[PDB]
Amino acid sequence: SVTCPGGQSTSNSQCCVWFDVLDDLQTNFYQGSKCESPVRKILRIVFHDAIGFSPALTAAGQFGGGGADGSIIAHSNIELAFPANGGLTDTIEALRAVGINHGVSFGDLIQFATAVGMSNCPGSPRLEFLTGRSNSSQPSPPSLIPGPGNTVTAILDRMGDAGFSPDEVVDLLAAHSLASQEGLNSAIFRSPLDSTPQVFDTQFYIETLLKGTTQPGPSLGFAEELSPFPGEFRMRSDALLARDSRTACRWQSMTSSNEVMGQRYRAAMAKMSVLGFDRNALTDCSDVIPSAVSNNAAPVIPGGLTVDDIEVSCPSEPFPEIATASGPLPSLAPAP
Numbered sequence: 233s234v235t236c237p238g239g240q241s242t243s244n245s246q247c248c249v250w251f252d253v254l255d256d257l258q259t260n261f262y263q264g265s266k267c268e269s270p271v272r273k274i275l276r277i278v279f280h281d282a283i284g285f286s287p288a289l290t291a292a293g294q295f296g297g298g299g300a301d302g303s304i305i306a307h308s309n310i311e312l313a314f315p316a317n318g319g320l321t322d323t324i325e326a327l328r329a330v331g332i333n334h335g336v337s338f339g340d341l342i343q344f345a346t347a348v349g350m351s352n353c354p355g356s357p358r359l360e361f362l363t364g365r366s367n368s369s370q371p372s373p374p375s376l377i378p379g380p381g382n383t384v385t386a387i388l389d390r391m392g393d394a395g396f397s398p399d400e401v402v403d404l405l406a407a408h409s410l411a412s413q414e415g416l417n418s419a420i421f422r423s424p425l426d427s428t429p430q431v432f433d434t435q436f437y438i439e440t441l442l443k444g445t446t447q448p449g450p451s452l453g454f455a456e457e458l459s460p461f462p463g464e465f466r467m468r469s470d471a472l473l474a475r476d477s478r479t480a481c482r483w484q485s486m487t488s489s490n491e492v493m494g495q496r497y498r499a500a501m502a503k504m505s506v507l508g509f510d511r512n513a514l515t516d517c518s519d520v521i522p523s524a525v526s527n528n529a530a531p532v533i534p535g536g537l538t539v540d541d542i543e544v545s546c547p548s549e550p551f552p553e554i555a556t557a558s559g560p561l562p563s564l565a566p567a568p
């Protein structure tokens with residue numbers, strides 16, 4: 233309906249500012265619309281911004297956090313001291329400058345950059361993008377971000393408080409399809425969590441279910457578990473969630489369908505994106521977000537492993553027919 237200055241057509245004039253943010257992010261933050269470390273850092277940031285939201289604290293007479301309020305940027309001094317917020321400052325500062333330059337709220341910007349960054353990763357769904365979150369925030373309370381050494385009970389309890397069911401926890405973890413670690417084991421920097429850290433696919437769910445056989449680094453880092461092949465890192469929380477009776481069937485159901493995984497992730501991310509906000513008070517600028525290039529690769533069990541190497545953990549459902557590959561085991565290069 234509306235036409236922005238750049239002859240960009242859109243639903244609402246509140247979207248027009250986001251085209252400039254798109255161009256800037258794609259050129260600079262994303263270094264030419266790539267799916268590399270900046271997107272992965274932004275996914276940590278979107279989660280860690282949003283999850284600073286705790287109805288249980290509010291019920292206990294305390295500030296529980298404002299959710300997707302950009303507090304991780306506005307109050308980065310406080311929040312980047314939290315255990316789970318390491319390795320983010322450089323990204324946060326990039327975001328800070330974009331937000332100030334274009335005059336958009338920090339919480340909107342994080343959500344936007346997430347949608348934009350996902351759009352650079354093959355196979356991603358089109359994440360919703362809503363604009364209008366206040367730029368005002370208070371610091372997140374501490375201790376609201378699930379950590380990789382937490383038990384499943386702890387993770388589900390925390391995520392549940394924030395508002396997510398166990399299924400949605402699993403669904404949100406599709407982001408570990410585009411993932412590495414840098415801070416858990418310094419010896420294998422950017423060791424990916426799945427064999428395709430630049431493709432938004434089901435490989436993460438498949439590979440976390442493989443028998444842990446491999447120590448990818450010379451020693452173990454924090455919350456590290458054996459992985460199924462060289463170069464791949466496995467964090468304890470993912471290992472446990474793949475196998476826990478409360479999450480294992482959803483986890484297994486992710487494995488064979490990129491398209492169901494993407495829908496579920498999109499939905500969960502939409503929910504996370506408005507923790508602390510009324511989505512009905514925001515403006516839908518989802519049309520600013522382009523579609524990602526499609527991923528034509530099929531789910532696979534890598535490296536000559538078979539379903540026998542999958543620790544099938546959903547006791548009521550057969551493991552999906554997933555193609556195998558030739559051996560030998562791969563060695564994952566560091567995520568770019």
Ligand code: HEM
Pocket residue numbers: 269271272273275276279319378379380381387401404405407408410411412413414415416417467469567
């Ligand atoms: C459910 C609990 C979760 C836990 C315990 C967890 C834990 C972690 C840890 C410890 C890392 C490694 C960070 C580093 O050392 O560099 C990681 C990476 C990552 N996480 Fe999660 N995470 C969880 C959920 C999520 C969610 C919901 C998202 C976003 C929707 C997310 C997105 C990412 C991404 C994209 C990376 C890769 C970062 C990189 O490659 O630099 N995680 N996560």
Ligand SMILES: *[C@@H]1O[C@H](CO)[C@@H](O[C@@H]2O[C@H](CO)[C@@H](O)[C@H](O)[C@H]2NC(C)=O)[C@H](O)[C@H]1NC(C)=O
Pocket residue numbers: 305306307328331332335336337338367368
């Ligand atoms: C969002 O609020 C933050 C403050 O929490 C504003 O950030 C400050 O912006 C001033 C003016 O540009 C900079 O000098 C400070 O460095 C910024 N502080 C921090 C902590 O980032 C930001 O300008 C506000 N954004 C909008 C659109 O109003």
Ligand SMILES: *[C@H]1O[C@H](CO)[C@@H](O)[C@H](O)[C@@H]1O
Pocket residue numbers: 420448462463562563564565566
């Ligand atoms: C196998 O090879 C990859 C590099 O090609 C490494 O990243 C991995 O740690 C293992 O050496």
Ligand SMILES: [Ca+2]
Pocket residue numbers: 280281282283284297298299300301302303304372
């Ligand atoms: Ca926040």
Ligand SMILES: [Ca+2]
Pocket residue numbers: 408409410426427428429430431432433434435436
């Ligand atoms: Ca992947």
